[PDB]
Amino acid sequence: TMGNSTVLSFCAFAVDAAKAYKDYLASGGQPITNCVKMLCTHTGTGQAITVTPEANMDQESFGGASCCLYCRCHIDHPNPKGFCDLKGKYVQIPTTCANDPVGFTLKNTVCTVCGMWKGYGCSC
Ligand SMILES: [Cl-]
Ligand SMILES: [Cl-]
Ligand SMILES: [Cl-]
Ligand SMILES: [Zn+2]
Ligand SMILES: [Zn+2]
User: In which residues is Zn(2+) 7 bound?
Assistant: First the structure.
């Protein structure tokens, strides 16, 4: 199976890093590991991205930058500001997806209404 530095290098130098990691995952590749898991009560709000850990009973909380493909690849973030929504914050990941937090944040979107991940916690 492939190791973290090899996966990250391959994606970092690709012209589309996100597509590289998604295509790697779809081929059965081993997810990036060593994301920073938090110890927390699991009685939090369940919001997706928060100032302190907010996992509910169905989620795990992680340090945000460790779960961000662009931070882990040390590359610019996609947007004219290059701003990262995860760095410095805590991200809640459904526990069924906690084996691949980088893939989860890459693939998913936060509901602008309820603040939870669309398709998972969001009940809108
Ligand atoms: Cl490696
Ligand atoms: Cl450990
Ligand atoms: Cl969720
Ligand atoms: Zn980032
Ligand atoms: Zn919602």
Answer: 68, 71, 77, 84
